[PDB]
Amino acid sequence: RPTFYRQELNKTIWEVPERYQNLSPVGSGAYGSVCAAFDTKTGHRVAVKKLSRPFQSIIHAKRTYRELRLLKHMKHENVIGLLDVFTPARSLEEFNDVYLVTHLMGADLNNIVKCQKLTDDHVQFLIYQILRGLKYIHSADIIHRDLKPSNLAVNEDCELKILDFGLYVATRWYRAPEIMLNWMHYNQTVDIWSVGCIMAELLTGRTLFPGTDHIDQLKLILRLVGTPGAELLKKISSESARNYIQSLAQMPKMNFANVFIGANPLAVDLLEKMLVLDSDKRITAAQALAHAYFAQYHDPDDEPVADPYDQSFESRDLLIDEWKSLTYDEVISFVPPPLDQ
Numbered sequence: 469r470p471t472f473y474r475q476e477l478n479k480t481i482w483e484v485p486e487r488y489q490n491l492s493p494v495g496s497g498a499y500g501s502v503c504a505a506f507d508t509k510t511g512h513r514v515a516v517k518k519l520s521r522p523f524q525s526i527i528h529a530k531r532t533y534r535e536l537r538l539l540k541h542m543k544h545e546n547v548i549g550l551l552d553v554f555t556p557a558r559s560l561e562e563f564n565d566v567y568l569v570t571h572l573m574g575a576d577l578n579n580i581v582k583c584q585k586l587t588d589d590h591v592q593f594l595i596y597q598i599l600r601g602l603k604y605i606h607s608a609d610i611i612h613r614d615l616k617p618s619n620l621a622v623n624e625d626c627e628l629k630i631l632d633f634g635l636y637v638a639t640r641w642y643r644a645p646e647i648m649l650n651w652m653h654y655n656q657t658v659d660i661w662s663v664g665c666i667m668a669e670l671l672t673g674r675t676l677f678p679g680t681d682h683i684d685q686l687k688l689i690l691r692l693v694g695t696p697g698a699e700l701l702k703k704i705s706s707e708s709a710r711n712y713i714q715s716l717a718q719m720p721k722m723n724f725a726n727v728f729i730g731a732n733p734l735a736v737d738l739l740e741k742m743l744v745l746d747s748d749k750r751i752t753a754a755q756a757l758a759h760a761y762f763a764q765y766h767d768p769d770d771e772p773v774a775d776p777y778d779q780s781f782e783s784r785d786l787l788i789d790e791w792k793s794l795t796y797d798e799v800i801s802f803v804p805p806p807l808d809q
């Protein structure tokens with residue numbers, strides 16, 4: 469066990485190993501309660517997040533467990549990973565705080581489309597890395613669900629990582645129509661819809677579907693992709709949804725070349741394959757990586773899948789102290805990653 473030290477920051481108590489020095493709050497609450505720090509073990513900048521009230525209820529306790537499990541699992545260049553997890557408690561009885569250490573990333577993509585007017589080459593590379601990280605998450609049967617520009621972080625070298633900072637830019641604007649309305653018939657390709665919205669915004673500098681609510685959101689969507697045909701109506705089990713959709717005045721699918729005018733036609737084509745209404749026909753991450761738009765970057769020998777992830781906990785109903793103990797176990801069993809770089 470290392471030696472900890474204590475300080476107070478922006479109305480919060482922080483007790484951390486001496487290893488971590490020069491804590492400095494970042495993002496004014498936008499990221500959580502998170503400090504930039506200096507890691508004396510590596511000489512690298514890192515980010516340290518202290519979870520807020522991790523075991524206050526059964527639901528917080530379970531979220532805490534889930535976040536820890538997911539973070540310990542992710543080992544891929546384009547997915548956030550865990551450098552360290554610690555608590556100052558010496559025993560389960562004392563266990564009340566969880567700190568998570570990750571790389572400190574440079575900026576989000578909201579703060580890069582909001583700034584730059586992105587080049588086609590930069591778009592290729594950024595979307596390539598999203599898709600590469602998604603192939604990996606998807607292969608472990610993990611669905612992101614909340615993909616949007618503020619959940620993507622990039623460095624000065626344009627190396628990208630997928631993350632989720634949790635609860636300016638609304639989730640609904642990137643959310644797949646099938647998990648907007650009903651929530652039964654969806655797959656991993658809800659994330660691909662989101663990548664299509666993101667890519668469009670990087671190309672044009674404009675939120676593709678900036679709806680004010682779920683109804684307005686759907687309307688903006690149908691204007692581009694057209695109202696569902698009879699083949700897709702057949703697969704809608706929600707009576708109210710089906711009534712709603714068929715109640716609307718029918719709209720043609722737009723030709724995306726007439727919308728994304730002047731874009732690389734390989735970009736346009738890929739967008740037609742991502743932004744399809746029927747989730748059974750939407751391109752997967754794995755398929756999209758092989759799309760000719762990523763010719764400069766695709767390497768089918770360097771797009772790894774994940775080890776399987778034991779998600780069985782998600783269907784369990786346990787007490788706070790049980791979720792707590794399980795999280796304690798995962799803290800104790802943590803093996804830090806290899807440092808060499």
Ligand SMILES: CC[C@H](C)NC(=O)[C@H](CCC1CCCCC1)NC(=O)c1ccc(CNC(=O)c2cnn(-c3ccccc3)c2N)cc1
Nearest residue numbers: 499502515517535538570572573574575630631632633634
């Ligand atoms: C919404 C639920 C909870 C809250 N989510 C999770 O469970 C996931 C892990 C799960 C995983 C994430 C990616 C794939 C999908 C699932 N959890 C994290 O992703 C997660 C966990 C911990 C952190 C800690 N790091 C930072 O805060 C950080 C890093 N870079 N910067 C930085 C700084 C300036 C400019 C730009 C960036 C930060 N502020 C960061 C993300």
